[PDB]
């Protein structure tokens, strides 16, 4: 699941996300901090609210859709939450 989600992130995100950060919006990490502060339910079900924008994605972020299926989506999410919580 989470070592899935390792090689989801690896071949989808580390063009932008290395190191759990943003390339392109530097304020808009994937640390802890970050993900609560900006994303919307994570203080709910914080791998649900990840599985979201992943799936819709918004501005520069592409959603995945498409291209990945639920259990990719659900794994690169538990991987993501996993990373943020331990400090990446
Ligand atoms: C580069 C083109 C990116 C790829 C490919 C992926 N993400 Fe992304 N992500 C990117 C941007 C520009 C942003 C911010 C967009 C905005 O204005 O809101 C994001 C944001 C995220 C977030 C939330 C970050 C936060 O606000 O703290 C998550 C949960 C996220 N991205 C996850 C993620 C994953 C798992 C990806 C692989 C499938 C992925 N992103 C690819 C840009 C890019």
Partial sequence: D???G?????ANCAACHMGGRNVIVANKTLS???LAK?????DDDAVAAVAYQVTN???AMP???GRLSPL?????????????????
């Fill in 38 to 42: 900006y994303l919307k339910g994570f």
């Fill in 6 to 10: 390792a090689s989801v992130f690896s």
């Fill in 72 to 88: 990719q989506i659900e794994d690169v999410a538990a991987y993501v939450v996993d990373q943020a919580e331990k400090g990446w």
């Fill in 57 to 59: 994605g918004k501005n």
């Fill in 32 to 34: 802890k901090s970050d």
């Fill in 2 to 4: 989470v070592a899935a």
């Fill in 63 to 65: 959603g995945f859709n």
